[PDB]
């Protein structure tokens, strides 16, 4: 710390790593870059795979979403307890990271095309989260060990988006929406997803959601 | 350990963690999977997120190809030294992800209408590399720090493949090439490289590199 996110003003791979720090009672500052701003090239070209999200922490500077989750959980410790915790984390977090992709691919690839294909393979994207889920203590508290992890931000984020895209999606997925439920309700989570800051933010920057 | 990997019959997403072990002078057993056992279905239906590599190390079960490199990196201490050297290592790790998911692309989704235009980006997708690689002790030694990271056997088969995609590639990028040079010219790692069970696999599985 501090912390600096500099992203576009959108929610987009910011938005789990800010859930991460708003419940874990951090502060940070928001640069925002306007699409005129990026379209002028000088921030661009300073980036080390010329995109956002760039990220400060004290003197490091940080770039690519999920190199800033797991330098977060594992400077605030949202890694797991320990090496099988730890595996674990990384595990949910790829799924997260793969159908994230295929979900950035839709919105911005081909949203009306493709968007009923999709929802129609979504239920066996979400599957093995909910599998996940229940080989954890029944899925009553988070799905790596008794403790919140980086992880856990990136999936709530996917979840919130994929109900947004597909209402009601989750209903045939008892366990991953009582998790939507029990996270959102954290004190501090709950005060971020329910401010300006966060509400007044457009999903994705197409404006497709 | 023991380690045991479970893919097809080629290099593809286990490459990079097979040239780890070896280099690290660490022994694994090939549990090698064809298309008639994965049509049979039911190893598919075991699999975390219905695909492959499959790792068990000892009594740990892991899926995702950089699960296991992390997984990997962080029990045989390949992860950098402190917190900055981890968190360019994830970032560089993520980099290597992003390409190799744009080559995968390529060979399997169009790889015919589309590899000029690959080709010609190709450029701009390894200069990052190449500055990161500039940045530590002028690229003469590793790309974090002074010791080998699981992320550098990722990085080096990403421009092991794209030598065979585009020869002279690396050309442009001396720095990234003195590196390829470098790691592969390590013992254990050229033994390896050098070895029937590499030279004999093919780079994908539909015939394209």
Same mark, same amino acid.
């Given at each position: 710390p501090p912390y600096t996110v500099v992203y576009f003003p959108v929610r987009g *791979? &910011?938005?789990?790593? *800010? !859930? /991460? +720090?708003?419940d874990q009672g951090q502060s940070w500052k928001e640069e925002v870059v306007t699409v005129e701003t990026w379209q002028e090239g000088s921030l661009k070209a300073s980036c080390l795979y010329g995109q956002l999200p760039k990220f400060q922490d004290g003197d490091l500077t940080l770039y690519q979403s999920n190199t800033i989750l797991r330098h977060l959980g594992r400077t605030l410790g949202l890694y797991?307890? =320990?090496?099988?915790?730890?595996? /674990?984390? =990384? !595990?949910? $977090? =790829?799924?997260?990271? =793969?159908? *994230? &992709?295929?979900?950035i691919s839709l919105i911005y690839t081909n949203y009306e095309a493709g968007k009923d294909d999709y929802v129609k393979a979504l239920p066996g994207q979400l599957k093995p989260f909910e599998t996940l889920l229940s080989q954890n203590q029944g899925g009553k508290t988070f799905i790596v060990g008794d403790q919140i992890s980086f992880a856990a931000y990136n999936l709530l984020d996917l979840l919130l988006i994929h109900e947004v895209l597909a209402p009601g999606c989750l209903d045939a997925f008892p366990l991953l929406s009582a998790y939507v439920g029990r996270l959102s309700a954290r004190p501090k989570l709950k005060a971020f997803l329910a401010s300006?800051?966060?509400? $007044? +933010?457009?999903?994705?920057? $197409?404006g497709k959601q």
């Open positions: *791979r &910011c938005a789990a790593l *800010r !859930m /991460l +720090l708003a797991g307890k =320990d090496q099988q915790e730890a595996a /674990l984390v =990384d !595990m949910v $977090n =790829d799924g997260v990271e =793969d159908l *994230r &992709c295929k979900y300006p800051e966060y509400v $007044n +933010l457009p999903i994705n920057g $197409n």
